[PDB]
């Protein structure tokens, strides 16, 4: 009952393998700190912690396939795979974007349905919806922000919030 980084992948997997609903992936956004010489501030930054992808034109496909192979070094690549992948390089200043707003105000932000995502004025919600997501969720924890996405419209269930609560840290 006080989780650490070594179980984080296991807990993310547990979260959407045990889920009653059809979630496409889970992401954990870990906090880090970015000191700025210019102001002296140590701003909280949410960056990629870990993730678990479950899942379910030809030029674009060529590029994506090309990117996959390059990454292997260092068959279709679906929209949600790509979104999951592209998500790995994103980060968020505390208070900004879906994870940063979630973390700053210790919030559950539950966006269900395409219009909820496009009406949120939130950039990552908009990107998710472009890649076919219909539900996006951010839940602040003690150590960052848990995010869930799905290509289906999923209502907030108490079962899911229960599992979340048993798999991450809270104050």
């Amino acid at each position: 009952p006080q989780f650490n980084e070594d179980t984080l992948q296991q807990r993310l997997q547990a979260l959407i393998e045990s889920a009653g609903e059809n979630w496409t992936y889970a992401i954990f956004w870990q906090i880090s700190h970015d000191f700025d010489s210019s102001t002296g501030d140590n701003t909280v930054i949410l960056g990629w912690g870990d993730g678990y992808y479950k899942g379910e034109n030809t030029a674009e496909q060529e590029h994506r396939k090309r990117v996959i192979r390059e990454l292997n070094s260092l068959e279709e690549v679906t929209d949600t795979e790509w979104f999951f992948l592209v998500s790995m390089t994103q980060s968020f200043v505390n208070g900004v974007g879906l994870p940063g707003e979630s973390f700053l105000n210790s919030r559950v932000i539950w966006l269900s349905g395409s219009g909820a995502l496009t009406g949120s004025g939130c950039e990552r919600a908009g990107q998710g919806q472009i890649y076919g997501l219909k539900t996006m969720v951010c839940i602040a924890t003690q150590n960052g922000v848990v995010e869930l996405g799905s290509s289906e419209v999923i209502s907030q269930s108490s079962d899911l919030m229960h599992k979340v609560n048993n798999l991450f840290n809270f104050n």
Binding site: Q9, Q30, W48, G49, D50, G51, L71, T89
Partner: peptide, 17 residues
């Protein structure tokens, strides 16, 4: 980026299946 590296690794390996 180690956190990204591990996730990337796990993602690609599971992708193979």
């Amino acid at each position: 980026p180690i956190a990204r590296r591990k996730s990337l690794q796990r993602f690609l390996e599971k992708r193979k299946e």
